[PDB]
A paper describes a structure:
During infection the influenza A virus NS1 protein participates in multiple protein-RNA and protein-protein interactions to perform a plethora of functions. The N-terminal 73 amino-acid residues of NS1 form a symmetrical homodimeric RNA-binding domain (RBD), which is connected to the central effector domain (ED; residues 86-204) via an inter-domain linker. Present models of the tertiary and quaternary structures of NS1 indicate that the protein possesses two globular domains, each capable of forming independent homodimeric interactions. Our bioinformatic analyses indicate that the N-terminal RBD forms a very stable homodimer, while the predominant and ubiquitous helix-helix contacts between C-terminal EDs bear many similarities with weak transient interfaces.
In contrast, several possible ED homodimer interfaces have been proposed based upon crystal structures obtained using NS1 proteins from various strains. While the helix-helix interface appears to be the only dimeric form of NS1 ED consistently observed in all crystal structures, it remains possible that other dimeric states (such as the strand-strand dimer) contribute to dimerization in solution. Although the helix-helix dimer interface is shared by all structures of the NS1 ED, and may have some biological role in that RNA-binding activity of NS1 is affected by its disruption, we noted that in all helix-helix structures the arrangement of the two ED monomers differs markedly relative to one another. However, at this same concentration we routinely observe complete dimerization of the PR8 and Alb/76 NS1 EDs. A key aspect of our functional model is the instability and flexibility of the NS1 ED helix-helix dimer, which seems weak and transient in vitro, but may be slightly more stable in the context of the full-length protein, or become more permanent in the presence of certain binding partners. ED dimer flexibility is likely permitted by the presence of several glycine residues at the homodimer interface (a putative GxxxG protein-protein interaction motif) that allow the two helices to rotate easily relative to one another.
Residue numbers in the entry:
A (entry chain A): 85 to 206
B (entry chain B): 82 to 202
């Protein structure tokens, strides 16, 4: 099947409202990165929702960052203009958020489903 | 013939080492034996990391002070051993520097490492 939607998150998790106590935000190419500076010493799970064409990444719809208690503390997503992006853009945006969260000695686990596609080649 | 097994590498001047600097908006971390700091206000600049450090044979042994400088000569960042001085490794420094670079890059600063730090890191 040549188009699949890979959904780390639930519906409720995709659309939930969240807020940063101490906002940090950055534009990496065609992607916006967000993280709450207030958060420290937490293990953090990256959950991604994205699409895939044949066996390669198509689009990242949304990635959110979760504490082990289910609280959202960060997010990556496409710029409101919704432009095209590469796996490399993504690899890069994920790296930059890992660095950001790691400042307050949080541990970050990437989405294994996304990384399986984003760290691919030809 | 050859150069000592111990050398002292000085990318900075005495005035450069002892100068105080202000972080407009502080961003500090401790990585074990190392303090990392930088000014969060700083944006879109070109920045060079410079270092005063010891070498044994061909590898950084002990860091004395690393600073981050704007093209104008303003210090915008710093990696310094904590003052009880409980020992760090060449590797502990490579790592700290990655953390300063990434933190600085957040605000679209462009960062270079000195050629010295490049040889002996």
């Amino acid at each position: 099947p040549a188009s699949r939607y890979l959904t780390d998150m639930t519906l409720e998790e995709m659309s939930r409202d969240w807020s940063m106590l101490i906002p940090k935000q950055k534009v990496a190419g065609p992607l916006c990165i967000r993280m709450d500076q207030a958060i420290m010493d937490k293990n953090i799970i990256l959950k991604a929702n994205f699409s895939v064409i044949f066996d390669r990444l198509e689009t990242l719809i949304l990635l959110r960052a979760f504490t082990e208690e289910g609280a959202i503390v960060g997010e990556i997503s496409p710029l409101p203009s919704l432009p095209g992006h590469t796996a490399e853009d993504v690899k890069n945006a994920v790296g930059v958020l890992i660095g950001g969260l790691e400042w307050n000695d949080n541990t970050v686990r990437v989405s294994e489903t996304l990384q399986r596609f984003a760290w691919r080649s030809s």
